[PDB]
Amino acid sequence: DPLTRVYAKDHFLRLLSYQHQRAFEENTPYTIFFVKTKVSKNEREKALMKIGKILKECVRVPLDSVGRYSDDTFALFVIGVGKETAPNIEERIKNHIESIGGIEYSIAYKSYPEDFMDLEKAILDLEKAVA
Ligand SMILES: [Zn+2]
Ligand SMILES: [Zn+2]
Structure with a gap:
């Protein structure tokens, strides 16, 4: 079921490279978000499933995807989101993590094509920005 699916790193990155090509071809922007959790070992399990659900909430269309980028980092890409609306999505993610309390994390995003191509x-x- 897509509404619950989180992709492994290499699966995620394959889907991201497909979307990157489609974005180029169709002149449409998209944005990549990274969230790295920086919590103690015995609260990592808890925060993982919680930030995972939070990023799943940002998924608007079936192509939007959440990936387990590393043992403590998630990635997300959201199609159709450029520089204008990317900060609103970041604030929403931060507000949800704030509503939980007690999770230390770093967040960063890059929008195509204005931040990068x-x-x-x-x-x-x-990677560097959330390390
Ligand atoms: Zn919500
Ligand atoms: Zn290069």
């Missing part, structure tokens, strides 16, 4: 560069930059 080279996908591997965006990905490297997002």
